[PDB]
Design a protein around this ligand. Structure first.
Ligand SMILES: [Mg+2]
Ligand SMILES: [Mg+2]
Ligand SMILES: [Mg+2]
Ligand SMILES: [Mg+2]
Ligand SMILES: [Mg+2]
Ligand SMILES: [Mg+2]
Ligand SMILES: [Mg+2]
Ligand SMILES: [Mg+2]
Ligand SMILES: [Mg+2]
Ligand SMILES: [Mg+2]
Ligand SMILES: [Mg+2]
Ligand SMILES: [Mg+2]
Ligand SMILES: [Mg+2]
Ligand SMILES: [Mg+2]
Ligand SMILES: [Mg+2]
Ligand SMILES: [Mg+2]
Ligand SMILES: [Mg+2]
Ligand SMILES: [Mg+2]
Ligand SMILES: [Mg+2]
Ligand SMILES: [Mg+2]
Ligand SMILES: [Mg+2]
Ligand SMILES: [Mg+2]
Ligand SMILES: [Mg+2]
Ligand SMILES: [Mg+2]
Ligand SMILES: [Mg+2]
Ligand SMILES: [Mg+2]
Ligand SMILES: [Mg+2]
Ligand SMILES: [Mg+2]
Ligand SMILES: [Mg+2]
Ligand SMILES: [Mg+2]
Ligand SMILES: [Mg+2]
Ligand SMILES: [Mg+2]
Ligand SMILES: [Mg+2]
Ligand SMILES: [Mg+2]
Ligand SMILES: [Mg+2]
Ligand SMILES: [Mg+2]
Ligand SMILES: [Mg+2]
Ligand SMILES: [Mg+2]
Ligand SMILES: [Mg+2]
Ligand SMILES: [Mg+2]
Ligand SMILES: [Mg+2]
Ligand SMILES: [Mg+2]
Ligand SMILES: [Mg+2]
Ligand SMILES: [Mg+2]
Ligand SMILES: [Mg+2]
Ligand SMILES: [Mg+2]
Ligand SMILES: [Mg+2]
Ligand SMILES: [Mg+2]
Ligand SMILES: [Mg+2]
Ligand SMILES: [Mg+2]
Ligand SMILES: [Mg+2]
Ligand SMILES: [Mg+2]
Ligand SMILES: [Mg+2]
Ligand SMILES: [Mg+2]
Ligand SMILES: [Mg+2]
Ligand SMILES: [Mg+2]
Ligand SMILES: [Mg+2]
Ligand SMILES: [Mg+2]
Ligand SMILES: [Mg+2]
Ligand SMILES: [Mg+2]
Ligand SMILES: [Mg+2]
Ligand SMILES: [Mg+2]
Ligand SMILES: [Mg+2]
Ligand SMILES: [Mg+2]
Ligand SMILES: [Mg+2]
Ligand SMILES: [Mg+2]
Ligand SMILES: [Mg+2]
Ligand SMILES: [Mg+2]
Ligand SMILES: [Mg+2]
Ligand SMILES: [Mg+2]
Ligand SMILES: [Mg+2]
Ligand SMILES: [Mg+2]
Ligand SMILES: [Mg+2]
Ligand SMILES: [Mg+2]
Ligand SMILES: [Mg+2]
Ligand SMILES: [Mg+2]
Ligand SMILES: [Mg+2]
Ligand SMILES: [Mg+2]
Ligand SMILES: [Mg+2]
Ligand SMILES: [Mg+2]
Ligand SMILES: [Mg+2]
Ligand SMILES: [Mg+2]
Ligand SMILES: [Mg+2]
Ligand SMILES: [Mg+2]
Ligand SMILES: [Mg+2]
Ligand SMILES: [Mg+2]
Ligand SMILES: [Mg+2]
Ligand SMILES: [Mg+2]
Ligand SMILES: [Mg+2]
Ligand SMILES: [Mg+2]
Ligand SMILES: [Mg+2]
Ligand SMILES: [Mg+2]
Ligand SMILES: [Mg+2]
Ligand SMILES: [Mg+2]
Ligand SMILES: [Mg+2]
Ligand SMILES: [Mg+2]
Ligand SMILES: [Mg+2]
Ligand SMILES: [Mg+2]
Ligand SMILES: [Mg+2]
Ligand SMILES: [Mg+2]
Ligand SMILES: [Mg+2]
Ligand SMILES: [Mg+2]
Ligand SMILES: [Mg+2]
Ligand SMILES: [Mg+2]
Ligand SMILES: [Mg+2]
Ligand SMILES: [Mg+2]
Ligand SMILES: [Mg+2]
Ligand SMILES: [Mg+2]
Ligand SMILES: [Mg+2]
Ligand SMILES: [Mg+2]
Ligand SMILES: [Mg+2]
Ligand SMILES: [Mg+2]
Ligand SMILES: [Mg+2]
Ligand SMILES: [Mg+2]
Ligand SMILES: [Mg+2]
Ligand SMILES: [Mg+2]
Ligand SMILES: [Mg+2]
Ligand SMILES: [Mg+2]
Lengths: 172, 58, 185, 56, 55, 159
RNA sequence: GGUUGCGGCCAUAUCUACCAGAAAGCACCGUUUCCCGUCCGAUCAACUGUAGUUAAGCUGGUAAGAGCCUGACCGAGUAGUGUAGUGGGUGACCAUACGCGAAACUCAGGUGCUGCAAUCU
RNA sequence: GAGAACAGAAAUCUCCAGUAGAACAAAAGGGUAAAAGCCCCCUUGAUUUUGAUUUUCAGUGUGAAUACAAACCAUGAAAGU
RNA sequence: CCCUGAAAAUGGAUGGCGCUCAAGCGUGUUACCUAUACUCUACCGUCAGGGUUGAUAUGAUGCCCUGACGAGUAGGCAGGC
RNA sequence: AAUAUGUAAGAAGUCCUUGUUACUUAAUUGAACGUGGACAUUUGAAUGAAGAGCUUUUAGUGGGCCAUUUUUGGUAAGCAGAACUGGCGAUGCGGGAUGAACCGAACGUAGAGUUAAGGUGCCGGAAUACACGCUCAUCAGACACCACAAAAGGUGUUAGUU
RNA sequence: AAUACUGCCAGCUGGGACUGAGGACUGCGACGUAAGUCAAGGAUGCUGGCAUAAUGGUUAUAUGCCGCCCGUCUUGAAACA
RNA sequence: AAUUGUUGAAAGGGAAGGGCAUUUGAUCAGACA
C-alpha cells in the first residue's frame, strides 16, 4: 500500500447515559499513514463487535517503533487472503530486521506469488521466532547455518556512458 | 416503420430550466368551494361588524 | 471551466433612457438624472424612470382622478405630479385649486385646472420649485384599463374576452359557450 | 481531542458529467470551479454536505 | 477559531482560487479516496501540504 | 389494452393493516377539525365513500372547509414545472391531524417562556436551534478498563 | 379494592385445563292477565322480586400451557442498499473505499390500562 | 365432528366447533361478522334545481366519482342513513 | 504464472520496431513529460456596479473607475459591411 | 430496509380583553371575521443568493441515439422495449494508435507557470529509474470500455492447506 | 544524549525564466533624534551597436508536427449516400 | 474570368492544396535624425 508504519489504535463505542465508560479495544495496524490506519481499525472492529465509526470513537492512535531495529530477526507471519476461487489461510516466514520492514515484503510476495492485492489480505499475527529450529520454511533455514558464506557470481556494473571502450568483465 | 413509444428522458431537465415554481401564497385566500350556508351567514356577519365600526367613527 | 449558476451576460431588462427621440424629452431626462444622482431624494429616482416608460405604461391621469387624490386627509394642498399627459373629465362638476405638473395637459384639462384657479407646471418648473420633490403627490394612471389586456390569458374558464372581429350572436357564442351546445367554456 | 470544527474544502474534479445532487451542494459550498476552495464550519447539517461530495 | 460571526466572516471571503499542486498530486490516479491511494475525501491534516503547494 | 382506473395499482395501498380490519374505532369521529388545521391523508380501505385518490395518499395539506361528515383539504400537486392548487373533499376517516406542527407549537410556547424568564432575569437568551456540534475534548480513564487487544480471525466454514 | 351502567385504547384483554369468589351488584331464576313475538313465552314482550341458586355467566388465581405484547452490543454491523475507481475475474460474479442498515433466530421480562356516574363490608 | 325410522357418498332433524376457510350479477384486487353476508318489514333518493371538487388533463371535453347548498320525499323509537 | 485443450479462407499486425533477472505479469517508491483545464499578467469584447454638465474647446447614445464572464446546430435578437 | 417522496421550522407569529351574524348551541354556547392590548431581530436550524416577483408576444422542435445502474421480451444480437442520471446529437481541445457517445477537460486573443487522463527502450516530449517476487511458451505475454474463449487436463515451475 | 521522521518561523541567502500594464500630485505605510530617505496605489539607471533591409511586413521554397470534400438529409457522412 | 502560347523565376521518389513556426531567396513600409 506504501512504505509501512505500525500503529496502535484504540477506540470504544460512544458512551451512553446508561453505559458510560465502554470497553476499549486495541488493534495493531500496519498502514502507511495514520488516516488509513483508523480506516483499517474500524474495518476490522465492525467484523467483530457491533460498532461503526459513526457510533464509536477513536481514543488513541500511536506509532509503535521497532524495539530492536538493527537486530536481524526471523519472523513467522500468519495471513488470511481471498484468491479468485475462494479464501484461504497461510503461514509464511520472513527474515528481516523489523516487523514493519517484513510486513512490507509479505505484501510484495502475496502480490507476486498469489496475485493478492492489498484489499484481499488480513494479517492475523506477525511475531518474532525465538529459538531457531522453530523456523519451518526452508527458504529461511538456509540463512541460519553456521559460519555461512556465499559469493555473488556474474557481476553486472551499470554503465554510466552510452558507449564503452573496454568490453565488460563480470568478474567479482 | 415503428419508432420510439415513450420516455421521460430529459423532461426533468426542461422542467427545472424555468423552475418548478413554488406554489405561491396569499394572505386572504379564496372562499372557493366553502360551504354556502356558512358563507351566506358570514356575508351578514361582516356586514354587521362593518356597520358597528363606522358607528365607531360617527 | 466554471459551473455557472445563472445566465451569463444578461441585460437588466429595465430601460435606461427613454426610447423616444424627442429632444425636449432627453433634456428633461438630462435634468433629472442630475437631480437623481446628486439629491438623495427618492422622488427624483422615481421620476427619472417614468420618463423612460413607453406609452402603454403612461396611461393618462384624468383631471378627476387628481381631484380625488386631493381629497385624501392632509393631501389637498399637495402639488400633484403626473409623468404623462393629463386628460379632461367632464364628469366632475367642481374642481379644486392646486398645482398639477405634467408632461402634457390636454386643451380640455388645462382649461379646467386654470379656470378653477390652478396652475399647470411643466416638469422642469417643478424641479425648480421642489428639487427634493417636497410636497409632491405622484399619480399614475390605470395601466390594465387598456383594452388589449382583456384578451391576455384567454383560455378555458378564464372569463377573458376572445380576440374577435365582428361580434353579436353568430360570433363565438355556441358550442363551448353554453350547456346546451356541447359544453360551457 | 475535540473533533475539529473547521474544515477546508477544495474542488478536485472538473465541471462536467456531475450528478445533480452533488452538483447543487458544490454550488452551495461556492466551489463551482476546479481547484477553488472555501472554509466550512463542521456541524451535522454540513458534515452531511461534505459526505455528499467526497468524490469531487 | 470559528467565532460567533464565522458565517459573515467566512462568506466575506471570495472562494480561494488555487493553482494545481506545484509538486503534483502524489497519487497516480486522483479520483479515488485518500485511503485508497487517490486524492479525494477527508485526508485530515494532510490537506495542508496539498493546499500549501496549490498556493 | 392498458388499464388506468381510478383505484388502479392500490392493492396494498388500500389494504387494511394486519389484524386491524373491521369497524373504525370511535375516536376517529370524535376528533374535531377547524379551518387551517394541518392534516395527513391516509385512505381507509373499509370506507369507500369520500375516499382520496391514490395520489393524495401520504400527502399532507390544510383544511379549508368543514362540512357534515367531511373536511375540505387544499393540497399543492405539482403538474409540469409548477404547482397547482387541488381541493379534496375527504371524509373524517381518511384524514388525521398532523403532528408536523406540534414540534413547532411545543417550541413556540417554550420559546416564550425561555424569553420571559430570561428577560425578567437579565437578558442573555439564545433560542434558535443549532445543529449537532462535534464532540469536545475528554479524558477517558484506563482504570478497570485496560484495552483488550483484537486481531482479525482466520477463515473457517462451519456448514 | 369489588360490582354495575356508559365508555377509550382494542389479546399484556385472546385460547385451552383446573381452583377460589365475602358483601353488594350483576346473573341464572318464577309467572303468562295485559302490550308484544314465536312451529316452540327457548329467543323476543310483559308481570313478580315473590318462590330457589352460586351451577353457570361474571371476576380473580394456577400452568418449565398455546397466542400476544415489550426489551436486548442474541443473531448481525450480517443480508440488502446509496455513492467511487482505467479495482479482481473469460465470464458468472467478487473484494475494497465513504455512508445507511434489516427479517428470521436466540435469551430475558410481561399477561390489560384507564374515563364518567351509581353502589358496596 | 358427534347424534336421529325407511335414508344409502348425497334428502330432512339436533347439538358442538368454526377470523370468514363463505357470500356480496360479472374479470380481478381491495373491502365487509349484532355486516357489506342470509331471512323478514316498509319503500322509490335510480326524484327536482343549478354550481364547486377528484381521476384522466391542455389542468379542454367526455365518462366515472366526491363533499355541500336549496327542495320534495323514503325508512327508523331515534341518532341517522 | 506457463503449457494442452485452441480449425478458415489476399500478406499483417500488443499501433509499429522490437523486447526474455523484459521494453512481459503482480506489486511498491520516486522523479519526469503535456490540454483550448488550473494560477498570475497583458489585450479584445459582453454584462454589472459606481463617478462625472461647472464655465471659458473638440464626442453626454459621452468621459473616468471597478468586478465578473466569453463552447454552440435549429433558432431569436443586436450592431455593422 | 437503502435510495427516492408529503408537510412544518413564526410579524400572514404568539397571548389577554371582548364586538358582529340570518349559521350553530340547552345557552352569548360555538364557528367565522374583527376593534383594543402585551412581546422585535438568536424573531426561532444549516449553506447559498451576479437579487425577487410578474406580463406579453414569437422561433425552432415534436425520427433521436449512447453510457453506468435498475429492467421486460428473445438462445442471442453492433436486437427490440421501459426507469433515474449523465452524455452524443449541437462540441472543439488532451488521452484511449484508429473511433459521435469511454477517461480527462468544455473553447475570446496571447505570455509564464502547474497539472488531469494518459504516458517516459526507439519511433515520441519524458528514468534502458529504483525495489521484491513470478514467467521461457517448436504459434509466450503485454493495461479499462475494446475489438473474445470454456469445461477439463499437466511429475513445467512457484508459494499454500490438511 | 544524538539522529531520523513530521510540523512551524511575520530566519538568512544563491542560480534561472517571463512580465514592466499605468503616466503630475492625492492612498496605506516603512526607515529615521532629526533633516530626510524608501523596495510603501504597475521600470528605472548606466553603456553599446545599427541608422540600415540591421529589425519588421509580404511572398515563394525547405524543414518539424498537424490537416480526409464541400453542400445536404440524417441517431450517425471522408464515405462503397 | 475559365482557358491558351511565349518569356522569367521555383518546386516535384504513388496526387495537389491547408495550419502554427522558422531558415533561405525575393520584395516592401515606416522610423532615425
Ligand atoms: Mg481500510
Ligand atoms: Mg464491512
Ligand atoms: Mg479479505
Ligand atoms: Mg541505472
Ligand atoms: Mg409508421
Ligand atoms: Mg428501431
Ligand atoms: Mg416520436
Ligand atoms: Mg416601459
Ligand atoms: Mg400604471
Ligand atoms: Mg372600457
Ligand atoms: Mg391582446
Ligand atoms: Mg360575439
Ligand atoms: Mg460554507
Ligand atoms: Mg464521513
Ligand atoms: Mg522538487
Ligand atoms: Mg516540476
Ligand atoms: Mg503527480
Ligand atoms: Mg496511470
Ligand atoms: Mg504556488
Ligand atoms: Mg395492465
Ligand atoms: Mg394493486
Ligand atoms: Mg355509492
Ligand atoms: Mg350474594
Ligand atoms: Mg325479556
Ligand atoms: Mg358464580
Ligand atoms: Mg363456582
Ligand atoms: Mg355480566
Ligand atoms: Mg406462554
Ligand atoms: Mg455479500
Ligand atoms: Mg452497494
Ligand atoms: Mg465496475
Ligand atoms: Mg456460471
Ligand atoms: Mg459499507
Ligand atoms: Mg441465536
Ligand atoms: Mg333418520
Ligand atoms: Mg358482465
Ligand atoms: Mg370481487
Ligand atoms: Mg350491528
Ligand atoms: Mg338461504
Ligand atoms: Mg337513473
Ligand atoms: Mg378535463
Ligand atoms: Mg388549459
Ligand atoms: Mg385539464
Ligand atoms: Mg397540464
Ligand atoms: Mg374539445
Ligand atoms: Mg370535463
Ligand atoms: Mg369511479
Ligand atoms: Mg508470473
Ligand atoms: Mg488479404
Ligand atoms: Mg495477442
Ligand atoms: Mg515489451
Ligand atoms: Mg509500446
Ligand atoms: Mg512492473
Ligand atoms: Mg523525491
Ligand atoms: Mg484541453
Ligand atoms: Mg489560452
Ligand atoms: Mg484570467
Ligand atoms: Mg453614465
Ligand atoms: Mg458564443
Ligand atoms: Mg461591428
Ligand atoms: Mg449600409
Ligand atoms: Mg436494510
Ligand atoms: Mg427531501
Ligand atoms: Mg350586535
Ligand atoms: Mg391591535
Ligand atoms: Mg434560514
Ligand atoms: Mg447545512
Ligand atoms: Mg449568504
Ligand atoms: Mg445582489
Ligand atoms: Mg413558443
Ligand atoms: Mg406525432
Ligand atoms: Mg408545434
Ligand atoms: Mg440491470
Ligand atoms: Mg437496442
Ligand atoms: Mg456519461
Ligand atoms: Mg444533452
Ligand atoms: Mg450538447
Ligand atoms: Mg464534448
Ligand atoms: Mg486526440
Ligand atoms: Mg486518456
Ligand atoms: Mg485500443
Ligand atoms: Mg479515469
Ligand atoms: Mg467516472
Ligand atoms: Mg515506427
Ligand atoms: Mg525521448
Ligand atoms: Mg530518476
Ligand atoms: Mg504465436
Ligand atoms: Mg498448438
Ligand atoms: Mg493458425
Ligand atoms: Mg511473439
Ligand atoms: Mg477488467
Ligand atoms: Mg483451469
Ligand atoms: Mg500448477
Ligand atoms: Mg485450501
Ligand atoms: Mg524538518
Ligand atoms: Mg521560513
Ligand atoms: Mg511603464
Ligand atoms: Mg507604461
Ligand atoms: Mg523613529
Ligand atoms: Mg521609496
Ligand atoms: Mg533598412
Ligand atoms: Mg548604409
Ligand atoms: Mg529581415
Ligand atoms: Mg527603409
Ligand atoms: Mg546593416
Ligand atoms: Mg537586427
Ligand atoms: Mg518564385
Ligand atoms: Mg506556401
Ligand atoms: Mg497526419
Ligand atoms: Mg468545398
Ligand atoms: Mg439512415
Ligand atoms: Mg439532426
Ligand atoms: Mg455511425
Ligand atoms: Mg458531409
Ligand atoms: Mg463505406
Ligand atoms: Mg510512384
Ligand atoms: Mg509562412
Ligand atoms: Mg528627429
Amino acid at each position: 500500500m506504501a512504505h509501512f508504519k505500525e500503529y496502535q489504535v484504540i477506540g470504544r463505542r460512544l458512551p451512553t447515559e446508561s453505559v458510560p465508560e465502554p470497553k476499549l479495544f486495541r488493534m495493531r495496524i500496519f498502514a502507511s499513514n495514520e488516516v488509513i490506519a483508523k480506516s483499517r481499525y474500524w474495518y476490522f472492529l465492525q467484523k467483530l463487535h457491533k460498532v461503526k465509526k459513526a457510533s464509536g470513537e477513536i481514543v488513541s492512535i500511536n506509532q509503535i517503533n521497532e524495539a530492536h531495529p538493527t537486530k536481524v530477526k526471523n519472523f513467522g507471519v500468519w495471513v488470511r487472503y481471498d484468491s479468485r476461487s475462494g479464501t484461504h489461510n497461510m503461514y509464511k516466514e520472513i527474515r528481516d530486521v523489523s516487523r514493519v520492514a517484513a510486513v512490507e515484503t509479505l505484501y510484495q510476495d502475496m502480490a507476486a506469488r498469489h496475485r493478492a492485492r492489498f484489499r484481499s489480505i488480513h494479517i492475523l499475527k506477525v511475531a518474532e521466532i525465538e529459538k531457531t529450529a522453530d523456523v519451518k520454511r526452508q527458504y529461511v533455514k538456509q540463512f541460519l547455518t553456521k559460519d555461512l558464506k556465499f559469493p555473488l557470481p556474474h557481476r553486472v556494473q551499470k554503465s554510466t556512458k552510452t558507449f564503452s571502450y573496454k568490453r565488460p568483465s563480470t568478474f567479482y | 416503420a415503428k419508432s420510439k413509444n415513450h420516455t421521460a428522458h430529459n423532461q426533468t431537465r426542461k422542467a427545472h430550466r424555468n423552475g418548478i415554481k413554488k406554489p405561491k401564497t396569499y394572505k386572504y385566500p379564496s372562499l372557493k368551494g366553502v360551504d354556502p350556508k356558512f358563507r351566506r351567514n358570514h356575508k351578514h356577519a361582516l356586514h354587521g361588524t362593518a356597520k358597528a365600526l363606522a358607528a365607531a367613527k360617527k | 471551466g466554471i459551473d455557472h449558476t445563472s445566465k451569463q451576460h444578461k441585460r437588466s431588462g429595465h430601460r435606461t433612457a427613454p426610447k423616444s427621440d424627442n429632444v425636449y424629452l432627453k433634456l428633461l431626462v438630462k435634468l433629472y438624472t442630475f437631480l437623481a444622482r446628486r439629491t438623495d431624494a427618492p422622488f427624483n429616482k422615481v421620476v427619472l424612470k417614468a420618463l423612460f416608460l413607453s406609452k402603454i405604461n403612461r396611461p393618462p391621469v384624468s383631471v378627476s382622478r387628481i381631484a380625488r387624490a386631493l381629497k385624501q386627509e392632509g393631501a389637498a394642498n399637495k402639488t400633484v405630479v403626473v409623468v404623462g399627459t393629463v386628460t379632461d373629465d367632464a364628469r366632475i362638476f367642481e374642481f379644486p385649486k392646486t398645482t398639477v405638473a405634467a408632461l402634457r395637459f390636454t386643451a380640455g384639462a388645462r382649461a379646467k385646472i386654470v379656470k378653477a384657479g390652478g396652475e399647470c407646471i411643466t416638469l422642469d418648473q417643478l424641479a425648480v420649485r421642489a428639487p427634493k420633490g417636497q410636497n409632491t403627490l405622484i399619480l399614475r394612471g390605470p395601466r390594465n384599463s387598456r383594452e388589449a389586456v382583456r384578451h391576455f390569458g384567454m383560455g378555458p374558464h378564464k372569463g377573458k374576452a376572445p380576440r374577435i372581429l365582428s361580434t353579436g350572436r353568430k360570433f363565438e357564442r355556441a358550442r363551448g359557450r353554453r350547456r346546451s351546445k356541447g359544453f360551457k367554456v | 481531542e475535540a473533533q475539529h470544527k473547521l474544515v477546508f474544502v477544495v474542488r478536485i474534479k472538473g465541471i462536467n458529467k456531475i450528478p445533480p445532487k452533488p452538483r447543487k451542494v458544490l454550488q452551495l459550498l461556492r466551489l463551482t470551479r476546479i481547484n477553488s476552495g472555501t472554509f466550512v464550519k463542521v456541524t451535522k447539517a454540513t458534515l452531511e454536505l461534505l459526505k455528499l461530495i467526497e468524490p469531487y | 477559531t470559528v467565532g460567533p460571526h464565522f458565517k459573515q466572516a467566512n462568506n466575506f471571503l471570495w472562494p480561494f482560487k488555487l493553482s494545481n499542486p506545484s509538486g503534483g498530486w502524489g497519487v497516480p490516479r486522483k479520483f479515488k479516496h485518500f485511503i485508497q491511494g487517490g486524492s479525494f475525501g477527508n485526508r485530515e491534516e494532510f490537506i495542508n501540504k496539498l493546499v500549501k503547494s496549490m498556493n | 389494452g392498458k388499464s388506468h382506473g381510478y383505484r388502479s395499482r392500490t392493492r396494498y395501498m388500500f389494504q387494511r393493516d394486519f389484524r386491524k380490519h373491521g369497524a373504525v374505532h370511535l375516536s376517529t369521529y370524535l376528533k374535531v377539525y377547524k379551518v387551517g388545521d394541518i392534516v395527513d391523508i391516509k385512505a381507509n380501505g373499509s370506507i369507500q365513500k369520500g375516499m382520496p385518490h391514490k395520489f393524495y395518499q401520504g400527502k399532507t395539506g390544510v383544511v379549508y372547509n368543514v362540512t357534515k361528515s367531511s373536511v375540505g383539504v387544499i393540497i399543492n400537486k405539482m403538474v409540469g414545472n409548477r404547482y397547482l392548487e387541488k381541493r379534496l373533499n375527504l371524509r373524517v376517516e381518511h384524514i388525521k391531524h398532523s403532528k408536523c406542527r406540534q414540534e413547532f407549537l411545543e417550541r413556540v410556547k417554550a420559546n416564550a417562556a425561555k424569553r420571559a424568564e430570561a428577560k425578567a432575569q437579565g437578558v442573555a437568551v439564545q433560542l434558535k436551534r443549532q445543529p449537532a456540534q462535534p464532540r469536545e475534548s475528554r479524558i477517558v480513564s484506563t482504570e478497570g478498563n485496560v484495552p483488550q487487544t483484537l486481531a482479525p480471525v482466520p477463515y473457517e466454514t462451519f456448514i
